[PDB]
Amino acid sequence: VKQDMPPPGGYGPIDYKRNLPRRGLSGYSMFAVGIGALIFGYW
Amino acid sequence: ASATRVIQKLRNWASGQDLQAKLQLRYQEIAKRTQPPPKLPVGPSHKLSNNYYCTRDGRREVVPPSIIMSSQEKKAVTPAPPMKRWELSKDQPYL
Amino acid sequence: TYKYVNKKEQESEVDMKSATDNAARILMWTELIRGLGMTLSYLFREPATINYPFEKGPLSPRFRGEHALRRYPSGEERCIACKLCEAICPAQAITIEAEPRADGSRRTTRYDIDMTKCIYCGFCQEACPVDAIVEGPNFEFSTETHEELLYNKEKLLNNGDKWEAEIAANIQADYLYR
Amino acid sequence: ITHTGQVYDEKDYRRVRFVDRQKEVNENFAIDLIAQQPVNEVEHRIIACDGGGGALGHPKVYINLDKETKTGTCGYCGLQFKQ
Amino acid sequence: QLITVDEKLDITTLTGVPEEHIKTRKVRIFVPARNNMQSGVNNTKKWKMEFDTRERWENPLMGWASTADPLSNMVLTFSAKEDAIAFAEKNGWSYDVEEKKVPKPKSKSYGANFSWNK
Amino acid sequence: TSVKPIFSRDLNEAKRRVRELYRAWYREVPNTVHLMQLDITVKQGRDKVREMFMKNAHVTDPRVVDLLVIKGKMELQETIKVWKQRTHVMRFFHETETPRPKDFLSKFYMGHDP
Amino acid sequence: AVIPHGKGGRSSVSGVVATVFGATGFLGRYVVNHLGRMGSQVIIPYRCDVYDIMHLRLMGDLGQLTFLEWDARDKDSIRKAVQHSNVVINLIGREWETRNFDFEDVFVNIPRAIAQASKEAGVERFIHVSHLNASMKSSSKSLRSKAVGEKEVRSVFPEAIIIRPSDIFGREDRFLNHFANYRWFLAVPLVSLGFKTVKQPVYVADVSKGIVNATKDPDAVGKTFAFTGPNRYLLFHLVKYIFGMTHRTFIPYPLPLFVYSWIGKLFGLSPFEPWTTKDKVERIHISDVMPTDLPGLEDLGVQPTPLELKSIEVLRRHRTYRWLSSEIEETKPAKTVNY
Amino acid sequence: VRPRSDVTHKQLSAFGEYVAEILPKYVQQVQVSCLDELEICIHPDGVIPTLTFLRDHTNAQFKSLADLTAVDVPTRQNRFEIVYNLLSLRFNSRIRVKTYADELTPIDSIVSVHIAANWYEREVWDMFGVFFFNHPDLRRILTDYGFEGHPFRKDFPLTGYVELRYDDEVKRVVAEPVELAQEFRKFDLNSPWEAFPA
Amino acid sequence: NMTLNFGPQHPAAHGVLRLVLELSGEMVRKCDPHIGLLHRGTEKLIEYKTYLQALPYFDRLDYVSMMCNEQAYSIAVEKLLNIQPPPRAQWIRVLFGEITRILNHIMAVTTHALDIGAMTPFFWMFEEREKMFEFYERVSGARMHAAYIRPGGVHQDLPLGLLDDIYEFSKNFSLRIDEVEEMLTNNRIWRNRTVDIGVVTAEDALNYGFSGVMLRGSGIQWDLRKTQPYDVYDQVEFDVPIGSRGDCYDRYLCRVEEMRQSLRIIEQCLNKMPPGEIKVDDAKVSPPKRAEMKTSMESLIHHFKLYTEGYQVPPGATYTAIEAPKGEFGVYLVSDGSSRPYRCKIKAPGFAHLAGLDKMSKGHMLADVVAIIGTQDIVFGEIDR
Amino acid sequence: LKKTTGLVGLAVCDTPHERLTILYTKTLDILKHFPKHAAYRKYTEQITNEKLDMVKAEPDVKKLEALLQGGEVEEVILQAEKELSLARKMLKWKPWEPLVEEPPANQWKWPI
Ligand SMILES: NC(=O)C1=CN([C@@H]2O[C@H](COP(=O)(O)OP(=O)(O)OC[C@H]3O[C@@H](n4cnc5c(N)ncnc54)[C@H](OP(=O)(O)O)[C@@H]3O)[C@@H](O)[C@H]2O)C=CC1
Ligand SMILES: COC1=C(OC)C(=O)C(CC=C(C)C)=C(C)C1=O
Ligand code: SF4
Ligand SMILES: [Zn+2]
């Protein structure tokens, strides 16, 4: 009768796949930042 | 939880993930203790009829190993059918 | 169904844009900075530790913990020395010798659980017909001397009397399951 | 002293163990505690002592209270019943 | 090619047993009898050789039995008398075999109990 | 009879191997007493070697002898390639244990089962 | 009594319940070792905190060693310790008269009260230990006071064995370590340039085994055994030999004792366990007495063990990496003096 | 009652015959348990040959050695029963080849056929005492450095003959003959009544 | 070569390991691992113990994958008894088996990092591990060393709140793998420490009997969970994470994937667990219920005999292998008709792996050896047995 | 053609059909010395002949991989020469001979 069982209709869905986010500034844009610092810093 | 929004936003960003949605610390989501009393189901063999054990005792109906090639044209035979190649996954073949 | 981990599907030919992105990854340690962000993030999360003396890590009713011998509500100790708790103990921990008490009842003259020998399997809890020997909730019984850990009938019966109220509640919660 | 009259002799040395320590014993002794419970006056020749609490008690057994002189005593509880 | 040795396999030197327990231990090869309590005979089938019993002094702290003899609880089971004797000879333990004693055939017939004159 | 030879066809050839092992141990005793800082005398140790090599002097069968040196060689390896520390070596000397008398009267006075 | 059952090793029973008041000592450690090995019940009265007696726990088996809190000034503590013991062994001794305990106390006063109670208790035998060559007139207050005790205790406890050991040779001993530790001192003073004070060391174990054997033997009653040794020595060879195994230079320079008793007085003033003692100094140059007496070792069943044999173990810690591997064979032996 | 497919008891049975035919010089018995497991039994001399055929035969590739063990039937003249369990990742089947070795009649080593056996063979020598010729480095693996006796032999006492404690006098760990404070209670458990014809 | 032993007390030695290293300079030319420091006599003790009272021993051979270990003994004994566990029990064993592989992998990935020097991944996951033990404790009463998976069926039904709590853990666990994923999978420092270290070629891995993630990491496609489906591994869908090249990185990446694939299997088990009994209904094999033994004579006799004497499994012998988190864990149980076993050879994925250390750690520094042991996931309980 | 085989150590073998035909024909040759009715000769000759015939028949390696199984073609090459090595080994072993020695009696009786 009462035994521990999955809820009616089943449980919801669970994520297993890697969700690592590729979030970053683009490389060219990045270089410019550091280069700009040097360029200005030198001036 | 119980974190000022700003800390949460810093948290979510520095981590790169909505860590708030899936906090590790458990809060009032865990099964309450003293869950209701359990009436567990009785399995087969509890019938009061046509339940003869002799008809349900694989323990010793087992027999001594079958013997082949005792010391006391023909095609080649393998241990078993050659195995079947596994197939690449479809949800995530790579990575 | 299999899945290739670390298998590069194809040879992406370097494109300046790609090369720059990569070179920037090596030169300005971009991925290393990514890792620092993750740890800074948790620094801001609430720590999961508990004040150990003040707060206690949760243990549900089946926790085996420390051995105790129960008594009937009337006051008659439950054990009737059938001695199969001794038979099924995996470690040879329980030693029982018995003789008919003056009342004429069956009782154990000596019941000694060697807790250092015991591996807290909980089968004794299982095996007892009268359920006289139970796995009590307490886990904090660390002792200065080895002899204290060896337990005779009087310590276990006393352990039983001290924790009977919770033992009864715990057995009450889990008996339907068993 | 203990339930079984376990009392180290006046000369035994295990008494050194108890030196500067408490010899653990229980005041509540069963031989006596069962006595207090009164004989149950059932009105059926054979009654059963499930042990109190059914599954939470002791294996069920039926006692014959037919002997008029004596009273049936459950080999488990020690509880006594008379007709 | 095989070499010839008439020396009774004695391997007492390889078994690794302390000298005291190879020269002072007598083992008896016997077929176990049946505790009269039960009428089953499945424990009176295989021969067993058992080492001689030794000291079992009481322990002072807890009163548990204590034994100084390592080969006490060891009872090896051998299917036939010949094989068990062999184990004693190569291991160097002394042996004193006891012949199996099996119940003699007994004639029984329900009719007898109703005999005119018994 | 009719046994297969393990490594030595006859007690003669086998004895050759024992000689070699004895030499090995003899040459090694001194080193061990120094690399393990054991508190024993090289002479003393070398007698122990002799003791052991004779404790098994009675063996007449070639096969048993051959295994005995295999095993013996293994022990040496554990003591020259040092994996066996002092506790292990000194055990050979049975230094802590109290010697038991073998005199009947002695045993009678002490043990139920002699 | 306790019938002796078992094979002879730990977890076996020998039937000797024994209070041993000064077990924490160098000799003591050894006494508890054999008593525990044999399987005897050992009650160890202790005053130092539990941390320091842990070294005694692994010796002996469970429920075989019992530790009791005890104070020498408090008579009651000694009373309960011997309540259930049948053998009492007294090893109470010190070299430095401490602020609150005088040589009399450590040797004569206390060791009396102890045996006194032991009798009241009904202990079968009491073993009292006093230093060798202990005249009631000997120079060192220590030795004389000890002599005073061996007399008294006989009146409190008649037929009480009195083993009288020489200075003891063993790891953690003073006799051997003291001299070896003179290294710190650039020069090693030696009264009479270490001559005319022939000394006969005795291995600690021999002493211990002897003592233990006493406990389990009826032959020793009122006996005043003297565990001595396997060879005597002029202090010169001893000192050098030590320095020899220690592989440290030996520079014997004579020092007038009258001045040296003063050096002992100096360190003696030290608050933390003076290293040398005026009473020590005298003792060190106090010649070992000759061996005409109830024999000890051998007589009690243990053959003495020569000093050179185990010296390597006692003096090893004092060597330097350079000599650590060096062995006894490489080194030379000292010479005895039947004189 | 467990579900049993006779497809396997037939496939494996046939293979058994195939192996036997191909290696008749050594195969003595080849049986399939009621549990669908094959167990070619080979003369000890066939250790090298039978394994090699299974490791390198197109119709029977048995590449990895799952285990090498030695039951000890003291009654059996040849005390040990070296058992080698092998797996064929190609045909998804396992086979067991078991030989018999007495105490002083060594078996060949298969470290050549499978290098997995380098360790298990040392394990069998240490526990049971069987010796393996041509082994690269046979030496005790599991037992103590100075252990005397082979432990898993049925004739070896469980508690053993030596135990270790620290002795102050000698300031070093020291063996002593075993003295146990509660001997292993040897419950007799066999019932005097059999279960079935088997 | 400056012989130096990786002595037991050192943390990287897993408590008991005496790797006699020959250091040709810092480069190590030979390793001779001296195991045996934790041999407890597990397989000589089992011969003296009945089949139920030997179950506990199997929870202590690999001590980081308790239940999967006790699923190998349970399957063996069950085979020799020609009995099969009830349907609910088989799902529960698969549910607990994957919680154990997540538990072993969190152990293996985080402790490997502890050895290399990354300390934070261990702390984040270990909190996620006590969340998991709680599931053991709530179902068996022991945080670890449960004894829940019994030779026939499992011991007691799941408490009525466990499957909801396992969903909440599995729901949020993947972010936790994702988080160490970011902190230790692209760090040039990890990759450099792990990539191209201890490469093992495919045929060499089969020949050395590696049989585990070590087998799969070099590209051989073998999972005893799909090839020879034990229990219900035929009714659950998962992808074996085969790696390509074999460096200690590809093996790490495979272990991280198996944790993810196990969450996929755990999901299916919670979604599809059948109503039913947790232990086979043959009183001869599995002990009678508490109420029944206290009201029916046939049940007390069966409880008394089973606890005191035993199952008395029919005479035979079997080698049953299950995919334990480390690799193939197999029990060769030889059985006489007696209630206590005759032999129980525990094949330990680990005896084979540690043998490979000398070959795998070839031309490698002292530091590489620390990674080589870490990537074999060796627990000395299984190797020493 | 392929970039690499799944197995780490194995390397792509170009001209795989030619490499297999070389190995397969060799084995057939060695087997030619085995005793005529020797079981290994008849059985392996049958297996090897079928393998060649298929290798001769199929000009596409991917379908060749399907026809004689073997997973990647490179493995089949390793299996064939492994068998070639054993064929040479067994000729020396002479396992086609009768049983070396009967088992001591009661050697294989498990109930014991
Ligand atoms: N070379 C030698 O050692 C020789 C020794 N002896 C005798 O043998 C006996 C043992 O010698 P040894 O072991 O070296 O002596 P130790 O200096 O080692 O001390 C012996 C024990 O006596 C205890 N003790 C000392 N003073 C007191 C006190 N006032 N109250 C209570 N307990 C005390 C100490 O306990 P704690 O440390 O806890 O205070 C210690 O455990 C001595 O009595 C000595 O006279 C005789 C000849 C030579
Ligand atoms: C996970 O593998 C193992 C470790 O390394 C990370 C160990 O440290 C240890 C022991 C480590 C200490 C010092 C607690 C064990 C037992 C182990 O199994
Ligand atoms: S089983 Fe329960 S009742 Fe029977 S003896 Fe052990 S404890 Fe006493
Ligand atoms: Zn009742």
Side-chain angles (χ1 to χ4, degrees), chain J residues 23-87:
Chain J
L23 302 155
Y24 284 137
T25 50
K26 289 178 171 294
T27 68
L28 285 184
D29 300 357
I30 299 202
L31 309 171
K32 293 300 163 290
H33 308 89
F34 285 83
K36 161 58 206 57
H37 299 94
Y40 188 50
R41 179 225 168 90
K42 308 176 301 223
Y43 274 130
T44 189
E45 201 153 319
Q46 175 210 324
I47 311 153
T48 43
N49 289 337
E50 183 178 2
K51 295 292 184 289
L52 180 63
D53 294 351
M54 286 187 273
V55 158
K56 293 189 292 185
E58 202 59 62
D60 172 44
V61 63
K62 301 301 290 187
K63 291 174 65 175
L64 192 49
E65 288 188 14
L67 294 174
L68 62 80
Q69 313 299 306
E72 295 302 320
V73 51
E74 295 85 357
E75 293 177 350
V76 175
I77 281 140
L78 177 63
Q79 182 46 57
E81 63 185 342
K82 298 183 71 68
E83 183 178 2
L84 184 49
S85 189
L86 188 147

Side-chain angles (χ1 to χ4, degrees), chain I residues 11 14-15 63 107 111 114-115 378-379:
Chain I
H14 297 165
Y63 37 79
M107 191 59 160
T111 59
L114 177 63
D115 290 345
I378 60 171
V379 170

Side-chain angles (χ1 to χ4, degrees), chain C residues 86 92 94-95 117, chain H residues 182 184-187:
Chain C
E86 174 192 65
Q92 294 300 320
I94 317 177
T95 299
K117 271 200 273 143
Chain H
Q182 186 173 355
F184 181 80
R185 298 187 294 274
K186 187 184 54 58
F187 308 103

Side-chain angles (χ1 to χ4, degrees), chain C residues 11-22:
Chain C
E11 293 177 350
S12 61
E13 301 308 334
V14 180
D15 161 32
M16 281 313 181
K17 300 192 299 296
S18 169
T20 56
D21 297 354
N22 184 8

Side-chain angles (χ1 to χ4, degrees), chain A residues 20-23 27-28 30-31, chain C residues 17 20-21 24 28 30 34:
Chain A
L20 301 180
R22 62 180 295 275
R23 55 172 185 96
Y28 268 103
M30 184 176 282
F31 289 110
Chain C
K17 300 192 299 296
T20 56
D21 297 354
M28 313 186 191
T30 59
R34 186 176 179 83

Side-chain angles (χ1 to χ4, degrees), chain C residues 69 79-86 96 108 111 128-129 131-133:
Chain C
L69 252 181
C79 202
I80 61 171
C82 54
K83 292 174 65 175
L84 61 80
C85 49
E86 174 192 65
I96 294 169
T108 61
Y111 192 89
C128 199
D131 197 8
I133 178 75

Side-chain angles (χ1 to χ4, degrees), chain I residues 7 23 39 66 122 139 158-159 174 185 201 232 268 292 330 362 377-378:
Chain I
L23 294 174
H39 172 253
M66 305 76 64
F122 162 103
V139 63
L158 275 66
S174 64
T185 299
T201 59
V232 297
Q268 293 177 335
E292 267 190 317
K362 62 180 180 295
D377 295 0
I378 60 171

